[PDB]
Symmetry: D2
Subunit: 205 residues, 4 copies
Amino acid sequence: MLVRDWMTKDPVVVAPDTPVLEAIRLLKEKGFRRLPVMEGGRLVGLVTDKDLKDAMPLSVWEMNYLLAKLTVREVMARPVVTVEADAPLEKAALLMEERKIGGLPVMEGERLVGIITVTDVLRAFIEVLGLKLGGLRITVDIPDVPGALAQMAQAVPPANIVSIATAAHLPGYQRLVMRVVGEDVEGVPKRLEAAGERVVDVRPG
Amino acid sequence: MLVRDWMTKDPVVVAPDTPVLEAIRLLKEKGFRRLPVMEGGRLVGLVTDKDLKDAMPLSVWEMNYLLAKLTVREVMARPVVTVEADAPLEKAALLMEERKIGGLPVMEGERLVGIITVTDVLRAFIEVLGLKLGGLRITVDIPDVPGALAQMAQAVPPANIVSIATAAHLPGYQRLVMRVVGEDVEGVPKRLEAAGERVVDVRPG
Amino acid sequence: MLVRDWMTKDPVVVAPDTPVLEAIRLLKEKGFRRLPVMEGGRLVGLVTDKDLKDAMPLSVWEMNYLLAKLTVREVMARPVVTVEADAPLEKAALLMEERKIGGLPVMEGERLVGIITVTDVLRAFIEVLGLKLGGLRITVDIPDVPGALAQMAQAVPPANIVSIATAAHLPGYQRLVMRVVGEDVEGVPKRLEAAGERVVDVRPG
Amino acid sequence: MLVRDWMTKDPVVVAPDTPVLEAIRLLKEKGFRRLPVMEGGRLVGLVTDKDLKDAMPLSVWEMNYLLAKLTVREVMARPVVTVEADAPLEKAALLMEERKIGGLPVMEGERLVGIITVTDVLRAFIEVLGLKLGGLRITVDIPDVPGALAQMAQAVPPANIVSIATAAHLPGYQRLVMRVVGEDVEGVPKRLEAAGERVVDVRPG
């Protein structure tokens, strides 16, 4: 799970002296929403469609004249928050959530290699947790001692586990959301509690 | 993991006859970005800040006069895609990613109880997968036979497993990204491969 | 020559609480350019198309929202300069030129009966000076003694004089621009100087 | 009375490729309202502040982007109506009233020497008719036979006549508006009708 595997490569970039209104049209016609800003071959700022639209430099033309001449440099954000291409996917999600952002320029050190957004990170979590694989979504409470998860896992075969998440740490218990697939997945809930495990609920993957 | 646990409750709503420009200012001053549209006490449409801004009904005043009178009804989207409050968190992420959306009205049947966004879903995944718990992030390749994960898990104690994801299904092997925490977590990589497991890489949680 | 004879009757009026953008459209669709403002059945202000257009109450929508709600009261001019319907036409021209204005509400005391503009005053001067009657335009220098004009005028018959203007008061001489029409107008220049008058130049009416 | 004597010399001009919004600001900061358009050293068009403001090339930015790039060439009027510098003042008034215009580029053949407006023409009529000279404004009805005006004029001395206009051609009578000044002007009304002339009314110049 790397940023590389989910980023969009070769994004559109813009220059600081690019006129605000030109930047806007560029974002419209190429389907993007944020625009990293290059100068001297280095990343010097970042602009979103919002930033451009909410730009504030009056009558209708003093204003209109002012927007017409406002440049990207005057509205771009810095310093820009970025992630390394080779970073774990989860780092991007962390950065995005911490700082309220929906998008993130992807770097190799000083170079720009792509862009990763919130919907890219969503796709990634959807893939690696198997949210599209059907099977069964099982919430189960296991004792919160080190060896318990290994013991719970023996009930699943012949079926497979694709992902486990901790819904909650509880007094005496760790509450797992578990997705299982494959052979005789329907048998899993039985086996789990017949093996003395505490099965909270079960629905389709 | 329910939509309930991550949604923002009691969102701002608007009426179809609300003027487009009034809706915009409402979104500015209350910090939201999408606006469900209520009528007759039912959800009849949905509008984003983008929808409102990109509205197209001319000189500067014919246009200006036209925006001034354009109503929410003329630009709202339907039918609105929603999720039930009691739905698993993962359902929201699925809906958002499928349909390119960043936000989702939350319902109890016909009633409106809140709103859940992409950053809410991010927070949720960040919590349940433990991306903020430190410990160790371990990519490990285990044989892709039913019983293998149970066997791999016995190496972790005295440390705990908080979450497992499948980075990839490979020939002969399932590649897991595993986050482990607690007592002697540093010992885990040793134990894993000393137990014959195939440890791909290790970095800090 | 009265204001009455040249004014446009029953002009469009507006109220102080009329929205600026509504006033603008009203001026577009009825062909006017200034809008007297009535309240309580009295004249309380005056607005031009310029005043409305150059109105200044920001981003593009804060501005747009602001214009949308700006009222005529906030941009109207007062006190309003007016002329009485029964006033000599020349009074309007004087008021318009003194105060740079192109239009003038026409009153009967406190009541509003019409509107007179610069092009109305132009029409009037064009009519009463006969600028469309053809004939001859004669610049002539007569001595600047009281009886001279009477003496110059005897040369015109059988032709008629329609108007006389003073192009300049000169040392020893008053320089007249005179328009003559009718029978044997071509004979006038001859008769004038043959009568010892000083004929500066002659062109077609 | 020439256009020369009342025109504003050395007006601001603009080029066809001048951006509409730049032309507008130029008119604001130099106090003019129309802008002749020069190219190749010849007059190729004319633009008013209205023309520029009412320009119509959509969302708020497609529009805004479009105005930003609209050039004077796309909105200028032609062919341009002009007057020769050496033309009689009255020609300008005729052109302005005929064609609804408030301004007129002033030429010497192919060259541009100035600009004359409606308020310039007003000033001129105000000067040559003596509307600011006080004295008496006398409406008088004289018989409409060739010799009558000469005969009426003998009553004015010792006072002077500065201008005569024809308010109306009537059955049997020409109705004159006459402005008289100087010595014993108060005596004129007496003398006129005592000389059998028909004095309609009298007010201050």
